[PDB]
Structures are given as C-alpha cells and as structure tokens.
Amino acid sequence: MNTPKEEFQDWPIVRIAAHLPDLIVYGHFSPERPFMDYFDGVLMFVDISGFTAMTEKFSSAMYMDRGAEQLVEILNYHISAIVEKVLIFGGDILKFAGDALLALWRVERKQLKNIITVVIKCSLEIHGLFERVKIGLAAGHISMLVFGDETHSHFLVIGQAVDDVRLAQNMAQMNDVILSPNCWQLCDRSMIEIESVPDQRAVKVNFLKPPPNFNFDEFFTKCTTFMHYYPSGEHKNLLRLACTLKPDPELEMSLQKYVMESILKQIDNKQLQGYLSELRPVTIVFVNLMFEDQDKAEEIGPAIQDAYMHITSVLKIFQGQINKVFMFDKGCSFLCVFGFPGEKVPDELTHALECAMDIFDFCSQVHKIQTVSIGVASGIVFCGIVGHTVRHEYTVIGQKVNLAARMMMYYPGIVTCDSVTYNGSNLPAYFFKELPKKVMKGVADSGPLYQYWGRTE
Amino acid sequence: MNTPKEEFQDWPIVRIAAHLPDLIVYGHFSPERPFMDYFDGVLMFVDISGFTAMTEKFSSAMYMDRGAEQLVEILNYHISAIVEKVLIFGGDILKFAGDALLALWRVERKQLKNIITVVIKCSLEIHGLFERVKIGLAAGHISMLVFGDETHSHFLVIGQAVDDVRLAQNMAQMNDVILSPNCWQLCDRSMIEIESVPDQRAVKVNFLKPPPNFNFDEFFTKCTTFMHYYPSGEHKNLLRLACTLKPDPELEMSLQKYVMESILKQIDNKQLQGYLSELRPVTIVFVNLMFEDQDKAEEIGPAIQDAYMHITSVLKIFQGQINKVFMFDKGCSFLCVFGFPGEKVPDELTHALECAMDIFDFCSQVHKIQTVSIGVASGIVFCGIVGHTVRHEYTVIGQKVNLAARMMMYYPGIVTCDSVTYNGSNLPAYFFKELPKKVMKGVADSGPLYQYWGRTE
Amino acid sequence: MNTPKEEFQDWPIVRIAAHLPDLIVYGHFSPERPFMDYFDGVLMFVDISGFTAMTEKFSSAMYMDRGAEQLVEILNYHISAIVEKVLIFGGDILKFAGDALLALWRVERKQLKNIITVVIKCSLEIHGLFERVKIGLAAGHISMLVFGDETHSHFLVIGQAVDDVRLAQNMAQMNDVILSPNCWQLCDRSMIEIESVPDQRAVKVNFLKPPPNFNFDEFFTKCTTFMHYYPSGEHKNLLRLACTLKPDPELEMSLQKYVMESILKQIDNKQLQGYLSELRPVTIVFVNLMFEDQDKAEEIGPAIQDAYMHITSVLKIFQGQINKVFMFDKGCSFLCVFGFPGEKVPDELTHALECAMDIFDFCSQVHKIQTVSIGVASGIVFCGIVGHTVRHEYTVIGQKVNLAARMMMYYPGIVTCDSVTYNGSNLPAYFFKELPKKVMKGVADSGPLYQYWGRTE
C-alpha cells in the first residue's frame, strides 16, 4: 500500500497568512474593537532605505517600462534574505514599510536578557549579508492595539519600547546596531562590548564576544523553549508554522479582514499575480493624530478606533485605502492612498483634499486627540507586494510618500498639499495658502507647498 | 555527465486526465456511440451531504463576498482526504456530485470476495478521518455506457449493483457502512461482523475482525496483483498512474470531449485558475428519463443516445450545459445548467422553460423511454472544481439543485418549475398551472411550484 | 536553529534567460552596435521538420479549436528531450526555428578534436530517442554579430562553419549524422567509421567505435574542463547554470532587449501563460540581404546594423516584429511578422506590402548589400513558445512561413507576394505583376504569385 508524500499547503488561508505576523495569525483574541493586549519582548527595526531610495533610478527611461518589475525583483531579493534570517532566529515580522521592517521576539520578562543576545546575533548576521542596513533594538513592555469595523482590521504595537526602537534606528549609521537604553539595561553585558553614543543614552554594539565555553547553537536551542511557534520536528524545514495552516472558515474570515480586497482577489486566482506591481500616479493622504500620552493604549485605543471609523467611511466614498498605520511619540499615522490599481476615480486630487479636510475636522473633535495634521502629495509611486514568499505585505514607496509624511510632521495642525495637488485640483486658488518652505529630512526640492484652508474664511 | 532529475508531468493531457476516472483514461474503446461494456466490481458510494448542506452558510454576508472561495477551500480540504484514501486502497473515483463521490474497484469475478475486504477497510478508514459521512457498498455485475456526439462524450455505469449502492447509501446513518445484499452474499464473512438492517436485506458492518494470522499489508499487496493501474515501482509515490501520461494527440482528442470547454480554457492557461469558483445565479433543468428496465444497457443505451443527441442540440442554442448524468432505478437523469460562468444569456428563465418543453416533447417520443420528467429551478448555486489535485470535477451545489432534482421525481411525467422561474419568465400566466405542494426530502419551503403547461390548451 | 532548504530561483531574470543562450547570458560584452567577436567551436544543426510539417493536421476540425495547444504540447514534448540531451552533453542551444535547433560547443582550437567526439555521441543519442531527425555537424572558426538599437538586440553566428552546418544538414536523410568537410578533417578518426557522401566532401557517420580502453564517462569529465558553465558541484542537478542567476538590474536591462515585449509581459505575470500559443492569421515578410562575402562580420556587420535600424523603424509603425534572424551563404534573412497576438492592425496586407517596399528601397542602397529580396505571404500560422522549460523561444511555424522563405530565394531582387496578400490588399491591380510559377522546395501549390511592382512604372 503506497504512502504518497504530501504536497499541498497552498490553500487560500495560507496565502492570506503570509501577509500577517504570528501575533495576529495565532492571536485568537476577541472581535471587539478596540482590542488591547500587553506583553514584553524585543523589537528589531531594520532600516532598508539604502535599498528603497532607488525608486528614482527605476523611473528612468533606461528601464524601458519595466521599472516596477525590476524594482520589486531586486528589493525582494535583498529583503527576502533579511526575512529568512529574522525567521530562523525565531522572530515574528510585524510589518514592512518602504523604508523598514519591524520584527518582534515576544517573551516572558525573565527571558528578555537571553533573547536580546539572540536578537543581537541575528542583527550582526543581517549586516553580514551585505558586507547597507541600520538596526535599532529595543526591549521591554509592549502594547498591541487592534482596531477596525466588521469588515476590516488593523493592528499597531505601541509603548516606550516601540518609540525606543525608532529613536535607536534613527541614531544608527550604516552597519550599526544600536541598543535602546532599556535594552542595554536588560541585556547580558558579559556578552557584548558596546560604546557610548554622543549625547545619547542608547549604545552601539561593537562586538558580541561570549564567554569561553559558550556555544551559540546550544544556547539558541535552549531559547527555542520560549518560542511558541518555532518550526520543529517534522516541520523543522519550514520558515513559518503558518505554512502549515489548514482550512478553517472562521479563522480565514478573521484574517482576511487585514488584507486589501485586491490582494485577496490575487490570492483567489481571480487576478494576475503581477497586476499589483506598478509605478503609477497616486495621491497620498498621510494623517497624523497626536495624543497627550503615547504609550497607554487604554486612552488612545478608543480614540484611534473612533477616528478609524470616520476615516474608513470617508475613504470608501473614493475607494481610498489605508495602506499602513504607524505609532510613534504619541502620534498615530494613517498612510492613505487614492488611485491604487483598479481603484482610480476622476478628480482624484479634489476628492483627496476634500477627504483630508473631512478627516481633519472630524478627528480634531475626537476625545483625547490633541492635534491632527494631514499631508497630501501626488505623483508616481511604486506599489507592490514586498517581502519573502512566506512573509510579505503590499507597500508603497516613493518621494511623494516621504514628502506627505514629512509635511504632516513639519506642518502640524493643518492640512497641507504639494504643488501637483494644488495645480491639478479643480478648487479655487483662495481655498489655499502658500506656505513658508521648510528644510525637511529626506526631501530635496519638494516644490511650493500649500495649506488647504478650505472653502470659507 | 550530469543526471538532472525529471520534473515535468504538468502537460495538458495530464490536467485533462484529472477530470476523468481510469475507466475512461485507459479505456481505449471504440468511438461509436452508444458504446456499452460489461464487467464486475465493487462500488463505494460516499455521501458527503454533511459537508455540502453548508452552501447556505457561505451565502451569508459574514463571508464578505468570498463565500464561494471559502466553500471550495473547505470542501476540497475534506474531500481531498477521502480521495487520497480511495486511491491508495486501489479504487477508481468515477464521479463527484454535490452530495456524493462514487468509486469503483473493477475486478474479475473470482477476486470480488477479497476486494470487498479491501473496500470495507478503506470505508472504515474514511470514517476514521472524521472522528460525518455515510457509505454504501455494492458488488456484482456492472455495465458501462458511453454516449455522445463528435465533440462531446459522457459516461454512466448502470445495473443492479449501481442501484444497490444507492439504496445502501440511503439506508446509512452517520458513520455507517452498509453492504448491499449481494455484497454481503459475496463477501468474506469470516472477516466482518454485521447486523441486520430493519425491513432490509442489506446489512451494516459493525466490525472488521480478521483471523489471528491475518496481515492486512500482505493481503493488500496480494490484491494489487489484480489492479491494472496501481502506482508501483519507480512510480509508487504517485496517487495515480494518470499523473504520468505523456502527450498523445489522438488520446487527448478523445479525453477532452468529456470536459467542459471553460475547464479546457483554464487547463490551457487561457483563463484564470479561479474564474470557475463562484456563487452565481443559474437555472437548473433536471431531466429524468424512465425506462421499462433499468439494468440492461443494450435497450436503454440507444434510447439515451437518441435523447442526448436532441438534448445537446437544444442546449447549444442557449449555451446550456450538461453538468452530470446519473442512473438509478431505471431513471437516467441529466443535470443541465443555464448561466454557467461566461455562458450567461438574456431571458435565461424563458429559454430554460422553452428548452425543457422541447426536450420533454422529443424525449417522450423516443423508443423505450416510458416517462420524461423535468424540474426547473432558479437561484444562487455554488459552482466550482471539487476534489483532489489529481482527481476532481466541476460541480454545482445548492438548494435549487436539490429542488429541481426532487421536483422531477415527485412530479413525474410533466415539466415543473419553481416560483423564481415562474415569476421571472416573460411568458403568460395561463402557460402554467399552480401545483399541489408535496413534502419532498431535503426540501424545506421550496415555495409555490408550477407545471409548465405550454402555449396551447 | 533550523536550516530551511532554498526554493526560489524563479525570478524574472531567470525567466528571461530561458529565452537566450549562454553565449548572450554570460557574454558581458560591449553595448556598442554592431558588436563582433570571434571564436572556434562545434555546431550541431538538428532538423526537426519531421515534427513541424504536422501543423497542417492540427488545423483540422478534428482538433476542435485546440489545435495550437495540442501542437505546442506534442512539439515541446519531443523538442524538450532533444534539448535535455544537448544540455547534459555540454552544448549551448543558440536558436530554435520551426524546422530546426542550432547548438554550439565553444572551445579553444586545441580541444576541437575531442569535443567533436562528444558532439557525435550526443548526436547518436538524440537519434536513439526516436528509434526522425537529421543532424549536420560542423567545426571551425565562428563569428558572432550583435546588432540592435537602444531597446532591442539581436544576434547571429556567421562564417564558413555556420554555412557548413546548414549544407551538412541538407545532405542528411532521416537518422543521418553528417560531418562537414572541416569537421571530418578536425575529428578523431580513430573513433568513428564514416562513409563518403555522393558528389560531396562531407561524410556520414556510420559508427562511433572507440578504442578498447576508452571510457566515455571519464572522457566526458575531462572534456568538462573546457566547459565554462557546465553545472557542477552543488548545482550538478541543474540543466543550466542560468537557472541560478540572481537579480541584477544592469544585466536584466541588457538581456530583456532580446525578448519580445509580449513575452516579457507573460514573464512579469501580467498576461496569461497560454495567451501566446495560437493558430492565427498573420502576414510574414521575409527579408533577405545578400552580400559579396558571407563569412566576414567586419564588412557585413555594419551593413546589417544599418539595415536593422531602418527595418525596426518601418515595422514599429505597424507593430510588426522581427521574430528571427538567420545567416547563410552570404544571405542574412529577417523573419518579420505582422499580426502577432495583441499586435493586430487593420489593412495588415496593404501595410505589409508598403513596409516591404520601403525596406526594399532603403536596404538596396545600403553599402555592401548586393541584393535585397522580400517574400510576403499571408495565412494561418502557429505561434508559440517552443522548447524546454529551461531553454525555449517564441517561434512561428506554417506553410506560409516556408512559402515566404522560398519566395525570397527563388525570386531574388524583387518583392513578391502570395495570392492571399494580393487579393486582400486595398491596392490597385497594376501595382502588381503575375509571375512565372517555379517549383520550390517544400512548397506544394503555393497559388499564383505576384511581384509587388509598386505605385509607379
């Protein structure tokens, strides 16, 4: 009697799970919104903007109309190698963004010290791949927020360690590994030689020099005792346990709400697998919400949910999409896009600005939101699924993405827009104010910027 | 000199063969129609209506427009496991229908007794997968009928054992294995403890308790001597020998005639592989032909061919399709569908009824057809390819499928239609008669039913 | 710590490389056009017209509109086996054409003798696959020419050995292996029994009978010392080293210029993988350029580049495409196609003829082109990607392809067209001259042929 080998793990639920971290896939938490949970862990923030500032070159006529395809190919080739390292070292990749990848090792407080050693070794091996990234590491308390409505879900991690991992990454230069102050306080200092960072309490890792009898392979195996989903046994040849998920309609109903409908259409083999890799004109509406206090989801969770409920209703009118949400220094940011593939509407510029002002006016009145700021920028951006086969996400990359992001931070409390949006809106000129030009990070020659003042005085 | 490993078995002819049993793939019989052949074997009828009555839940708004995709995913996950068991135990899966799967072990008469033991063990292992199916087993003489024209082919198995396997399956409750009276007469009673079935000559298998020195693995190997196509040797890791078919234009020309053109288009990579999984509105025209004598293909074969020739010409006018043909208790049934994906026409309801009446009038005059009955029902049905990667078939599932099927049996000798068809036809009301409402199996609240009386008195 | 196995080699750059020989993939030569290089090697010309004269049968109504699909399936099944033999024996497949496959073993002059032995054994093993091809072998100096513009590239091999391999193949009968005179002069005569060819200096291989202590496996291994890209070590299970190419935007930019945009669209998963396999009506414009001297790229290279520059500008107006370029007996031939899938225009016939006359008039004035001849033929041709998964090319096959090719050779110095083109052009009849009918190889009943004389006297 024969024993044919199994082949089939390529179910829709597995394809959906590629777009999500284990934090969500195996979370099995309540469907109430907002949902908040609390834990401890180590965060790794890998800055990949050496690789993503290349989107300019790929718009060149040299690439003969295959710019988007070449860009996603070379990006995924390099990001895939980073992903594999994170996953084999036991990390859960939470999110991809144009300029970064955030990973989490969730553990009980008593194992933080040893897990930081694992994460530092992982970091050093990532830098070894490119002998061009910057790595910030943090550790400590982490809060998770899940918000959404009956058809869509989003999640965020928040807290001091999340803020810390961003600050640490910003301090880093090429090939640096920077530990947040609490990570350095928590780590095993017998193992790692550091140096101080000027004017900073964070530290830079110079060396991982373990004691004479230390065996990293045996140490790592001991650490896998605390990793709930590390592929093992019969499945030790897989990068993710999620690769083994089996059909389960209740679970798939839950997980699909995190993924854009156009991606679900490709997952269902109802759209060509390359339709979503494109250089295309879009309008970015980057919404920033600032609170009094950054690291307490119990106060900001309800506010973000209330904002989200209004944002989704405004965007739906114009097939706008929330591509990503981020949280830093008591600012929660929504990266909204008008014009994604198959979602284009006429008067995109006008409607982007009217939607921004609607969001601005509503969210300004939401309890506990202190300031709303919105940047609106329009131009050619790269869109596509970025990452590894087993862990990837739809992402947008481009100068206009970075411009809208810097505008909402450098011009707080107002709706701003770039010259493309201003000139191509069908709105009267006195609806706008020409702004002073500010030197903004990563922005060279943004063009004239405007405040959308709106229809009345 | 290198020895690269072979990879390629994914030819069109192999993809086509997934949709067909070995009875056809390796049949190499005449192209004359009708064709009849005669043999002996064991039939297994696995009732999967615990799984297919779920189509209701998947039309719920809870599934956010991915009902069809979730349904085919979970169905195929469970049906695939049944298929693998049947195939490793040496069976040939003849047909899939919404509510069942029919498999055949064809053998010489002298090996029936031992093959029934194999099939009973297979049955018990299928029930073990779900520790929700019902299994009927029959054995004896089996006739095969192949009918069609120059471009399309269909096949049927007929005879007392085919009738027996249906009756046995109907007697079964969840987790039962029921042996037809001839199967019990033919089987190895030293091996299996049975109990009587009230008012029935069939029996229920309680236990497979073989003698002290019995080794099932060695017994099965001896039984593979009589299985012409059991994967073996270099190919012992395959579920089907058909996986190894090599291009052969004359054979592919023959096999493609059994498969719908929309499926061939997907096989040829000219249509997206998920286009055919849909919840869509269709009209089912379920045609039943009753003969004087059920189990003699020599008399009914020519009649079915003559009917088919007319049915295909009527359907072609409106891109109707024969999805399945079945044979029971001297009734041959055609499951016809108007509105399959890419085959929709306007006035579908009117044309369904006019086509039914045309079929009715013609087939009523075919020699040896005693009664024609046609049920017409319209609504949302699931359509998609159901089964295992190596053995699957396009199938339709839904309350309206079951309703049309019950209508042709409970209202024999006439054309009947449901309320959706009546209300949405463009035909005058006096073309119809409102019928008494009958309690019908599996039908709850069918709605008012009508006879299509037709244009004149 | 787990060690998952690598899976991913299916990058766009790898898919592109399937369409190209190693001569180009690993060439890393200048982007100047024309580019010429010079080397030595052994050529094998495998004539597959036993297999490709079948396109007639597959247009029959017997194939029920799946003629193209069945044809490409059976062709690729047989051609794939030839390709695998060539590749394992160390050859580089340069080109596929309807009626042939050309392969190259490039080596230093001192290793020619031993490589010819390898190539003869390869040839005999190819004939063993079909126990229906004809094989010609040549050896000696080979020139390579690369021509094109900033977006498209084409290459050719030229010289006496290239002419020789064609002549040798023409002399061959079914199952023959014919050695060109220089190949016989260069080979190891202790190894191979030959017989003379009537009126020819070429020879036919009767037998490969090596000396008593000869071990072909050990001999082949010694010969792999001179094969730069023979898959080895960790990659000894691959047919091509190109299967391991990694993303490299500068290299992909270079390689894509050799591949049609419709193929690139399929490679990018933006078109269905079977869209390009079709039986469709096209117009073939077969352009032949004859020079004074055939085997010196230094003189003919600049002329072909100048012609190409004009040809591409004329074709672009009507989405005509260069499908293949060939070089024989100081004739360089361009196989141009109007009407490829997704490239159809109205008045295709008129524009084909006007484009031919434009090309004729320009190329007739190019320095060192002695004669231009153009054949124009219109009808149903097979189009599709022909070859092995790892080495394949888009190809056109059909009686009208062969007719246009014979017309440009049998009617030199003029533009000729077939009856379909003449009757369906919108041009006046006195623009044409009815020609004497010539008996042409492989052409039976071409129909009346015409010279396109053009608008004035």
> CA-to-CA distance for C290 and B326, rounded, in angstroms?
68
**Torsion from C-alpha of B77, B80, B85, B87, nearest 10 degrees:** -170
Binding site for hydrogencarbonate: residue ranges of A?
95, 157, 166, 327
The first and second tokens of residue C270, run together, are 């933006």
Q: Is B37 annotated as a binding residue?
A: no
> CA-to-CA distance for C178 and C160, rounded, in angstroms?
16
Q: Is B199 annotated as a binding residue?
A: no
- Name which of C1, C5, C269 is nearest A273 (Cβ-Cβ): C269
Q: Is C163 annotated as a binding residue?
A: no
Q: Identify the burial level of B397 via C-beta atoms within 10 angstroms of its C-beta, where 0-12 means exposed, 13-18 middle and 19 or more buried.
A: buried
Tell the CATH topology of C275-457.
Alpha-Beta Plaits (3.30.70)
Q: What does DSSP say about strands B134-148 and C391-397: parallel, antiparallel, or unpaired?
A: unpaired
- Name which of A73, A88, A274 is nearest C1 (Cβ-Cβ): A88
Cα A439 to the center of its chain, rounded Å:
25
Residue of A nearest to C264 (CA): A66
Task: Read off the amino acid at residue B166.
Answer: R
> CA-to-CA distance for C418 and C407, rounded, in angstroms?
9
Number of residues in chain C? 457
Q: With contacts defined as CB-CB under 8 Å, which chain B residues touch A269?
A: 272-275
Neighbours of A429 (CB within 10 A): 11
Q: What is the DSSP letter of C14?
A: H
Using CA atoms, how far residue A92 sits from A4, A45, A457, B358, C331, in Å, is: 33, 12, 50, 64, 63
> CA-to-CA distance for B276 and B256, rounded, in angstroms?
18
Q: What is the DSSP letter of C6?
A: P
Integer-rounded Cα Rg, in Å, for chain A is: 22
Binding site for ATP: residue ranges of A?
47-52, 99, 134, 396, 402-406
Verify whether the Cβ–Cβ distance A256 to B66 is below 8 Å.
yes
Write the CB contacts of B434 (distance below 8 Å, at least 6 apart in sequence): B448, B449, B450
Residue of A nearest to C12 (CA): A73
Please list the alpha-helical segments (H only) found in A278-347. 297-317
Residue of B nearest to A266 (CA): B274
Verify whether the Cβ–Cβ distance B69 to A256 is below 8 Å.
no
Mapping DSSP onto H, E and C, the string for C197-254 reads ECCEEEEEEEEECCCCCCCHHHHHHHHHHHCCCCCCHHHCCCCCHHHHCCCCHHHHHH
Paired residues of C289 in beta bridges: C332, C372
B81 touches chain A (CB under 8 A): no
Q: What does DSSP say about strands C35-47 and C134-148: parallel, antiparallel, or unpaired?
A: antiparallel
8 A C-beta contact, residue A13 and residue A248: yes
8 A C-beta contact, residue B91 and residue B105: yes
Using CA atoms, how far residue C435 sits from C359, C417, C428, C448, in Å, is: 21, 10, 17, 8
> CA-to-CA distance for A418 and A412, rounded, in angstroms?
15
Q: Which of residues 47-76 of A touch C (CB under 8 A)?
A: 58, 62-64, 66, 69-70, 73-74
Mapping DSSP onto H, E and C, the string for C325-353 reads EEEECCEEEEEEEECCCCCCCCCHHHHHH
Tell the CATH topology of B34-242.
Alpha-Beta Plaits (3.30.70)
Matching residue, tokens 């009118």 = A317
8 A C-beta contact, residue C178 and residue C171: yes
Using CA atoms, how far residue C274 sits from A104, A421, C341, in Å, is: 43, 42, 11
Q: With contacts defined as CB-CB under 8 Å, which chain A residues touch B269?
A: none
Neighbours of B244 (CB within 10 A): 13
B342 touches chain A (CB under 8 A): no
The nearest CA of chain A is from the CA of B274 a distance in Å of: 5
Q: Which of C75, C119, C272, C390 to mutate to test the interface with B (most CBs of B within 10 A)?
A: C272
Verify whether the Cβ–Cβ distance C256 to A66 is below 8 Å.
yes
Residue of B nearest to C269 (CA): B272
The first and second tokens of residue B377, run together, are 């029902």
Using CA atoms, how far residue A22 sits from A93, A139, A241, B400, C455, in Å, is: 8, 19, 9, 41, 74
φ, ψ for residue B310 (rounded to 5)?
-75, -45
Sorted by where each begins, the domain ranges of chain A are: 34-242, 275-457
8 A C-beta contact, residue B93 and residue B18: no
- Name which of C64, C236, C272 is nearest B2 (Cβ-Cβ): C236
Matching residue, tokens 């600012």 = A331
Q: Which of C86, C82, C56, C58 is nearest to C72 (CA)?
A: C58
Q: A398 in helix, strand or coil? A: coil
- Exposure on the CB side of residue C332, measured as CA atoms within 13 A: 32
Q: With contacts defined as CB-CB under 8 Å, which chain B residues touch C277?
A: 268
Number of residues in chain B? 457
> CA-to-CA distance for A357 and A310, rounded, in angstroms?
12
Verify whether the Cβ–Cβ distance B70 to A151 is below 8 Å.
no
> CA-to-CA distance for A277 and B161, rounded, in angstroms?
57
Neighbours of A261 (CB within 10 A): 16
Using CA atoms, how far residue C383 sits from C98, C275, C331, C393, in Å, is: 10, 10, 25, 11
Q: What does DSSP say about strands B369-388 and B415-417: parallel, antiparallel, or unpaired?
A: parallel
PDB experimental method: X-ray
The nearest CA of chain C is from the CA of B268 a distance in Å of: 6
Q: Which of C1, C149, C269 to mutate to test the interface with A (most CBs of A within 10 A)?
A: C1
Integer-rounded Cα Rg, in Å, for chain C is: 22
> CA-to-CA distance for C41 and C23, rounded, in angstroms?
12
8 A C-beta contact, residue B421 and residue B353: yes
The nearest CA of chain B is from the CA of A269 a distance in Å of: 5
The nearest CA of chain A is from the CA of B74 a distance in Å of: 6
8 A C-beta contact, residue B133 and residue B82: yes
C221 touches chain B (CB under 8 A): yes
Verify whether the Cβ–Cβ distance C246 to A77 is below 8 Å.
yes
C389 touches chain B (CB under 8 A): yes
> CA-to-CA distance for A154 and A159, rounded, in angstroms?
17
Q: Touching A: which chains, 3+ CB pairs < 8 A?
A: B, C
The nearest CA of chain B is from the CA of A134 a distance in Å of: 41
The nearest CA of chain C is from the CA of A89 a distance in Å of: 7
- Name which of B89, B232, B272 is nearest A270 (Cβ-Cβ): B272
8 A C-beta contact, residue A10 and residue A250: no
Question: A233: left (phi > 0), else alpha (psi -120 to 50), else beta?
Answer: left
Q: With contacts defined as CB-CB under 8 Å, which chain C residues touch B249?
A: 58, 63, 70, 73-74
Q: Is B99 annotated as a binding residue?
A: yes
Please list the alpha-helical segments (H only) found in C289-397. 297-317, 348-363
Q: Touching C: which chains, 3+ CB pairs < 8 A?
A: A, B
**A348-363 vs A297-317: helix crossing angle, rounded to 10:** 150
> CA-to-CA distance for B339 and B348, rounded, in angstroms?
7
Q: Which of A35, A214, A245, A50 is nearest to A130 (CA)?
A: A50
- Which uninterrupted H or E stretch holds C67? helix C67-88
Q: What does DSSP say about strands B92-97 and B153-158: parallel, antiparallel, or unpaired?
A: unpaired
